[PDB]
Design a protein around this nucleic acid. Sequence first.
DNA 1: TTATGTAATACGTCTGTAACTTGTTCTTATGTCTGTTATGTAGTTAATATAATTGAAGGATTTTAAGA
Length: 52
Amino acid sequence: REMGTVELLTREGEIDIAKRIEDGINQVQSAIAEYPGTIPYILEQFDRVQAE
DNA sequence: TTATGTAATACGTCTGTAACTTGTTCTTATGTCTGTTATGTAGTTAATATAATTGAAGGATTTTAAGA
């Protein structure tokens, strides 16, 4: 009874939901990027990995 | 009578046994460390697919809460 009250989706529904998910994801990522210590962490991680 | 010399006898006693004890020396059982292999855990896969499930059955009486 509980799960039958949700309508079934189509292709375009999946596309729209995926677009909403990525929109939220990149909002979160942009929020993280605006932080003075975030970029140095990625930079030092790249510095370590590039040294193999 | 009395010196003398043998003889019984009791007590030290020199030595042979044995107990107490330690050195030390060798052997072995055990605990531990380390290296290798098997076991146990975990993450991922992209035609599409979109309301179970399986039974089960001749019961006969009481008492006690919900519904009206």
